[PDB]
Design a protein around this ligand. Sequence first.
Ligand SMILES: Cc1cc2nc3c(=O)[nH]c(=O)nc-3n(C[C@H](O)[C@H](O)[C@H](O)COP(=O)(O)OP(=O)(O)OC[C@H]3O[C@@H](n4cnc5c(N)ncnc54)[C@H](O)[C@@H]3O)c2cc1C
Ligand SMILES: Cc1cc2nc3c(=O)[nH]c(=O)nc-3n(C[C@H](O)[C@H](O)[C@H](O)COP(=O)(O)O)c2cc1C
Ligand SMILES: Cc1cc2nc3c(=O)[nH]c(=O)nc-3n(C[C@H](O)[C@H](O)[C@H](O)CO)c2cc1C
Ligand code: FES
Ligand code: FES
Ligand SMILES: [Ca+2]
Lengths: 257, 198, 446, 408, 387, 204
Amino acid sequence: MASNNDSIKKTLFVVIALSLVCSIIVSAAAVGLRDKQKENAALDKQSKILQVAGIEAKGSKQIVELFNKSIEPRLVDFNTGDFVEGDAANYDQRKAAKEASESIKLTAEQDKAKIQRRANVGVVYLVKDGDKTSKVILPVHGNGLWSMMYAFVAVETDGNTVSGLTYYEQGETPGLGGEVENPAWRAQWVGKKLFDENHKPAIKIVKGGAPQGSEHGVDGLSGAYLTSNGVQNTFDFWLGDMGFGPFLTKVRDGGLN
Amino acid sequence: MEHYISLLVKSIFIENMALSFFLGMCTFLAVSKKVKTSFGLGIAVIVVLTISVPVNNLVYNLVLKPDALVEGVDLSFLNFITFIGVIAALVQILEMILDRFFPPLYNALGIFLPLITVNCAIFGGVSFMVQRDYSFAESVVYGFGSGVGWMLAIVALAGIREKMKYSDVPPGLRGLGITFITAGLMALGFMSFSGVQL
Amino acid sequence: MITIKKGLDLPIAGTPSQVISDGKAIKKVALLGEEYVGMRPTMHVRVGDEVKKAQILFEDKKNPGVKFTSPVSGKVVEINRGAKRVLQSVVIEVAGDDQVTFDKFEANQLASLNRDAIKTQLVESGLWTAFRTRPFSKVPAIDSTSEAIFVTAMDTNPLAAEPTVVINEQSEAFVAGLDVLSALTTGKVYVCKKGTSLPRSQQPNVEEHVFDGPHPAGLAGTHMHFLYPVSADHVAWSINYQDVIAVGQLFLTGELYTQRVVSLAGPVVNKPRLVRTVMGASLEQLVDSEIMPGEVRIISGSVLSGTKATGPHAYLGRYHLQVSVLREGRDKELFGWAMPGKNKFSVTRSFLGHLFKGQVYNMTTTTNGSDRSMVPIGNYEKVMPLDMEPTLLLRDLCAGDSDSAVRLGALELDEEDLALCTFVCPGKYEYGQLLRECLDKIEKEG
Amino acid sequence: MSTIIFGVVMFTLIILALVLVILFAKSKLVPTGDITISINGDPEKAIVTQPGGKLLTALAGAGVFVSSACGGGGSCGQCRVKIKSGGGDILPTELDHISKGEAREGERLACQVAVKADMDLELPEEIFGVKKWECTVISNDNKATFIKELKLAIPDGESVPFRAGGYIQIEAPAHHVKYADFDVPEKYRGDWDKFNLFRYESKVDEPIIRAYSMANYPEEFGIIMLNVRIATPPPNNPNVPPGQMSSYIWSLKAGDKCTISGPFGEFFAKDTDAEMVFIGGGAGMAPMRSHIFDQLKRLKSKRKMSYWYGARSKREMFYVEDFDGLAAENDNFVWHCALSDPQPEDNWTGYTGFIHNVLYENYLKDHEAPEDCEYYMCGPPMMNAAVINMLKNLGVEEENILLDDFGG
Amino acid sequence: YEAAATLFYTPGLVTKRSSHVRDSVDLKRIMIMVWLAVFPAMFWGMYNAGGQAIAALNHLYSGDQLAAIVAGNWHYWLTEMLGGTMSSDAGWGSKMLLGATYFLPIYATVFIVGGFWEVLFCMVRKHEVNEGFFVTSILFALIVPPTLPLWQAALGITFGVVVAKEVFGGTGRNFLNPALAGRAFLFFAYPAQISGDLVWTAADGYSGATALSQWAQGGAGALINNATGQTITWMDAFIGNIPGSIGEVSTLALMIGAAFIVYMGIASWRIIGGVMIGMILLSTLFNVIGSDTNAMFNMPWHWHLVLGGFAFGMFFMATDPVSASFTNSGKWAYGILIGVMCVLIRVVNPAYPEGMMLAILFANLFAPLFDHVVVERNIKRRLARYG
Amino acid sequence: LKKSVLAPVLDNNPIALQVLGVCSALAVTTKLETAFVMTLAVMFVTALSNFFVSLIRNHIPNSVRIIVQMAIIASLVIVVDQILKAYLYDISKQLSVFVGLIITNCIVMGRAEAFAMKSEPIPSFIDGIGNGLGYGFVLMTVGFFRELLGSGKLFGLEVLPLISNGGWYQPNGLMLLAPSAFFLIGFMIWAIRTFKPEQVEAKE
Ligand SMILES: Cc1cc2nc3c(=O)[nH]c(=O)nc-3n(C[C@H](O)[C@H](O)[C@H](O)COP(=O)(O)OP(=O)(O)OC[C@H]3O[C@@H](n4cnc5c(N)ncnc54)[C@H](O)[C@@H]3O)c2cc1C
Ligand SMILES: Cc1cc2nc3c(=O)[nH]c(=O)nc-3n(C[C@H](O)[C@H](O)[C@H](O)COP(=O)(O)O)c2cc1C
Ligand SMILES: Cc1cc2nc3c(=O)[nH]c(=O)nc-3n(C[C@H](O)[C@H](O)[C@H](O)CO)c2cc1C
Ligand code: FES
Ligand code: FES
Ligand SMILES: [Ca+2]
């Protein structure tokens, strides 16, 4: 082959040089920008929390100052629903759950699959109007058809009425599962009661659409079975005894204050 | 055993690479003219996927997984480049083998032989393996099943196109356009497994 | 003993009386150029030439050494040519009894003659054109040989004659022809017959095989499929019983034997029967005053596979042993496609006709519908007894895929093998032409 | 920093391992030894080369190779070779020019064949006859408006072994030519002046090769007579660039050095007793003259034959004396000429119109057996189509139709 | 007007070559015979739709409310105007008339639009308009709910005729079922109008599931007719006194119609037998395995037969000659695959309660592959000189 | 020269004539925003990879050419994704699920093999830009119909008011599934070869 490119020495030299190049570049790009990427992710989470709480904000400065002004992170024990002392502002529930110090759920109570472990302490965001509490935001998540889906729920301190819901991290196929992020679909969750008179979970994702005024039903996602099902299972779990059940009971009895 | 049989059936039918997830469509549409050419191409794809998925499983779990080598260093940013390098080496060897021993297939594929590297189905399979965190045996079974499903899809399309020797397609649609429409109809047919969970 | 279960005996009206009688005197005979596959003639006569019996009329360019000779002594009166000056027929007006004479041997010597001597005598007499080759149904090349020669001593075509009646009248000639064929072959000779007795040769390489069932149980293609599967590497020859009698007569008396016994039958023939005629006779003069009034079609051969004998073609054929006559069905009826169908035939049970067993039909030449695409309701499988995929093969022929058709078994077939498939097609396709086109392509391209 | 060095090192090591595996695999799947291709069954004059590359290049290096001008594949199928061993199966492209029966016998295209293993060829005896190329121009005078006759004298009177109707491969170097260099008598300059086309010129970047047929029959030893048609842009498309080699050869003059290849080609007559019918137009006069002279003078054939030539006007016709003498001295030869549209200066009396119609109306309309004789043919493509259609309608078979299809 | 003449009269042609005598059958007779075989199913479907609607209306409303509801629907007040009654004591005539006012507009729309497309394509390609579209249109009209909007019907028939058949060259040239292709287009484009609990009885404001959906929830004990309070029985499902698509309900009527075209030799008893074998095998396997949380595991074969569109599909849609396998051996496999897929989608797929059209469209993709396997075996036999 | 950059739009389209970008065309064409972003990304990556491969085309051994090309392409894609995540987080969020699909987009490697290995740097860059434009033409045309008919929106702006919001339009659910993309591309090819009939395939 021309210009002795077939020589073993030439081949090895070419490949090693072209690896050193593009390796330096990829590594430098990946490691230099990590902090900026994490900052952007955190700012996006704050923006999503504000949006679900119902506060208009634009720009990093406005978002951060409003979040500091209006939202008060807090920790809960799940098992007892009691508020737990701690920072509550730098707590990483994902890391906590991955740590071996936390619980592991057997199939019987693992309603929402592929979540093997649950943290013993969760974080909730209390909306403030004045000095007392107007709402509470609950982070919930569950496995979908493709990956893990995370969302916020914004109950109104009575323990039943939803008042808002957003998905701040999901990777479902656009058009079918990605519609979980549709504003029109998100609008259906306003006013749903989330509990029946016996205080059992009662939120339903109805296949084929829910009758008007159902007061517990939310339309499923067209052509999106198993992801409507994941959305059902996540709530079935997180409203149960293993999730925010006891905490929502203590909120319902007026203990939120 | 039922675990692996369930995984294999899932990969072949419920998550068919071609007619579900619609991956690896370029060569699937281009090289569907003859059943036996499609059969050979599918065998090659099966071999490449079966070898690629386990090797990439090992590489990721041993050097690229967080804290795999030493604590605090994460090399996951090299996932794509490492995976594609492995696949490229495999296709490079496949080229020599086909040239030596299967000259008819080598000539039939033509331009698309080196393009098996960038067949979206293989890279998608490796990525799905990494996301789902399969073990080594599960990786082997998953790669084999995905390859078998892709081969089944392409062979079925080739059979349809051969049956269409009796058709009267308009000149404008002859070839690529009618093949596109046929593939769409096949997708409609394959929507039967939407909602079944293995 | 081989039994064919899939087939069809067409219940057309007017079946012949199996008794031989003298026919109308014939004054003109002809040789039809288009009848022979792949023939490109070279004329050796011109209008106004006097000829003798067995004198050469023309020769084939594409098959050197093969001679086509005159059946009678007389004068050439027409050399008909059609589109692109394609030879249609050479017409001779009978007169005199001059003839060319060849060598004659005794009966006991025929089985041990030299193959080259046999071949030269046949070629010179012009009786070499009785043979045909599967594949391609062409006259064999004079320098070739074959391991299998198939004799057809049965006939299952509708309205066909009874070979037993004809053969029993010429037993010595039939046996002598069988002996000559046994000497001429390099393998076996297959005498295909029905269950009844025939004169038989004492040579050990001549064998009798019995076939039972409906049409096409009596076709050389069927016999070959079951006894000697043919292909590009295995080539068989076929010849009918009357030609075997002619061969025996030639080698016994040194003279060309041109007499025939054909069946004149059909729905419009007053007295169907077998009649003695001569090779290439004029069908117009043969059926003179034998037919009912009206517009009719005269066919050389069976209705399944014959030649419309009009104008320069009538003029009986070389390989045909019967003449069929039936009305021309140009009628146009209202809602005819929707009638119950008491008097309508079909291999489908969608008419009332099939409920009356033993009913014969005065069939006409109507095409009971228009040309349409193929919707395979499974009619072909009912009438094809060979081990093939008929619907797939027919779609291959329609699409023009010669290689695929060859793989599927086109080389084993003749136009007469697809006659029933053409007959029962709801789309009114004609598969003889498609098969011939495919075979021409295969022969030319390689 | 500790996580950049790790990444660089790990990626480079992985790539190096993969490349080493590839090299090891190549060491076994790709042979490196010599091939030793045999150009014929004889145990001599064999060629030993390294593996890889197309077959044609090995023969080119050896110096003896089959005819080809385009040098490519999949178009014009102008290269052929016979192979008995090796060479693999027939590439699909080749089948577009190779019949299945030929493929069974082992015909192949040199361009498409790849040198992977030892193989033996069965090249004919003809291509070994390639000859030295030097030759001297004697004259390049004009004979028709757009045609000139070029005469070449071979050194030492060498008798090039060419058959009637063959052609030679001619070569030219890079050059720049202007039409003003061309010289023509006063007779033909009217057409030139009509367009004032002397402005045309062309450039040849690198040497080019073309093929031409000799106008002399074998008995004319030591001389190569040639007929060349000038490739000029279409009258309706003056902007079209002109032809290179036609202009270059027209540039030559008497006494100039010239280069030709060995004798090659096809379109030879056959050895039957059938009548012959030579029909040609324009540039096709050379093969017809070669055939006619060979048959009448060398072979002294008694078979009947005739020649039919079509021309635009009386000014376009030549060799009239040769053909008239042939007809007068031979009773078996008759020649006729048809003018498409004679001009006033012609004062023409006789057959007019297209040659195919003239021939059909005068000879083939009454012929006893049109299909029996043989039709040798050479002319412009549309005349070729017309005469082929006429003959086919008359019922002549392809085997009796022989022609050279270079389209003047 | 030459359109009527070429449909009423016979061509009056003769034979030019080959066989000088031809069989009496032709494509026109085949298609018209298939067209007539669904008439009992169509008539019973109209009658049943009317009966279901009237029963539901009188279960929901009464008196002045019923009068107001009637006055607000053109179907209802046209039925009353033409002499019928919408009272609970309505007769078979009133029920059939009410069903007709639903079926006939759908059929007319489908026929006109599909005919427009067929005529356009045939004119452009200079062919003769042929039958088969009759079968396509009538089947498509019969396999939809009684409440399907007319514009949706038009879109569905357009898709089925054009995309699935005409671009391939027309009748006999395609590989997919056109009617089921149109139905699938509707099913995936506008699910709310061809699925659920508000579609299968043409009663205003009425909601009710049908047998296949109720067996998913409970067992055979969950099959109850809410309009009348009775329990659906096997005989009710067999005769056709149940809601659903217009022409699918009566298994008895479908069997009567299909016996004729099977006897005549137009439909493939091999395909029908394959479908039956596959269904029986898979349903009995599920019964043997059993399940604690899925009630569909204990549904027997004789119940699978009479529910949903299984009988309609098996008899009239799985037997399309063009879309099926062309070999006798391939027909058995084709039918078995269709039956297996139908039962499988019914049982282990919770998204869909029925799977007949999806199963047929799935098997249409693999029929040529079965043909290929069989023909390759035949070719090997040939190369062996048949031993 | 614009004649060089505009040819692949209709004369040599990477999808309508070549079969090189089908998967992403089926995937990312439910919104014009994602279609536009993917078009830009593919154009940029193909141009740069063609340039870099052509720079060193004379030193690449035939036995590792695929490895070299894929290394360059993957490095470019990874760096681009990192930069988008760092500075254009909003856009990166849309393209995150399809980042990997860019590496195996057959257009990039097909043009590197077919053109860059034979041509010079600037011509290769122009060829990459032209093929990106041709790819974007099909992507945008399909996305127009899909988005408009499946949601009544163009670039997220309401155009056909939906019934769920008091409108009159009922969205088509099949426009959110791949078969709609298959059919749309088929009919696009039909129109493109009805005009410019030189591209019609032979036989039949
Ligand atoms: C074996 C063989 C033998 C032949 N022998 C003879 C012979 O003896 N006598 C004879 O007269 N001819 C003969 N020919 C035919 C032909 O005259 C020669 O091939 C001649 O050498 C070709 O002319 P050229 O190479 O000078 O023109 P080229 O430079 O090859 O040009 C070919 C033509 O294309 C045109 N052209 C170029 N570019 C364009 C463009 N962009 N658009 C449109 N048109 C364009 C040119 O103007 C010219 O008309 C023979 C051909 C063959 C194959
Ligand atoms: C031929 C045919 C095929 C059908 N295919 C399907 C199908 O694939 N999926 C579906 O959900 N319904 C399909 N249906 C509709 C159902 O058979 C039936 O009309 C509907 O399910 C009635 O309500 P039920 O499911 O409660 O019984 C089909 C109907 C027919 C006639
Ligand atoms: C027995 C039989 C069944 C048919 N079934 C169908 C059918 O289910 N759908 C349809 O569109 N056409 C049907 N047709 C008509 C025709 O065969 C079909 O449209 C072809 O696929 C057209 O090429 C049927 C025809 C026959 C004879
Ligand atoms: S295989 Fe070509 S882009 Fe997916
Ligand atoms: S055309 Fe010259 S080598 Fe093929
Ligand atoms: Ca947790």
